[PDB]
Amino acid sequence: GAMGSMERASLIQKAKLAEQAERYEDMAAFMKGAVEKGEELSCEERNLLSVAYKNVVGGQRAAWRVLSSIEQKSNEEEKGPEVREYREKVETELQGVCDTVLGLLDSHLIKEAGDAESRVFYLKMKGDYYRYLAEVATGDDKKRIIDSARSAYQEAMDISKKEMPPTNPIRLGLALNFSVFHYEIANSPEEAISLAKTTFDEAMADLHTLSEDSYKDSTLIMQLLRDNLTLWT
């Protein structure tokens, strides 16, 4: 790895600088290097890893959607293979980023994560990046990719419900994304709606236990659940 010669602490420091400069590809490479040092990640370091790759894959997903739309229109004047070729190029890049993240989780973040907050975080991430693979998958391994996302989300859910209070932001963000998995990927809008509503209601009833700062963290994610329920119902 090109980051093998840099100190772990220097990689984390530069990841934070890259975030300030909105250089997310750099940020991701720095955090990949930090992960490959082999030590577990702190809470803040996990969120640096997540922010970096979410922004990288977010740009790829947005570009893929633009190109896929153009391609679908083209298939309703013939302009040659270029639209498909370039959509395939972006798609392959996107799949490579997803494979990279999943590789870091499998070697060896998840197996060393024993605390609920780390294990749920990583399993949610595993579900997320299989979901992004599912967004562009067509047919053959599409079913297996979808089941891999489902399995990761489900293990994360089981742990979060046993070990975390209903207002825990990690638990809430997991439920949010799993509900979108149901709605957008698994063709299960009723499951999506039920999960979002139950998650929201159980969090509501637990808010009274929280400090002002924790209340703000939890209600921010609860608003995203409500925003989806407004779109879906």
Binding site: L176, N177, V180, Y183, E184, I221, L224, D227, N228
Partner: peptide
């Protein structure tokens, strides 16, 4: 477009 964690 559904909202996921940002």
């Amino acid at each position: 477009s559904s909202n996921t964690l940002r």
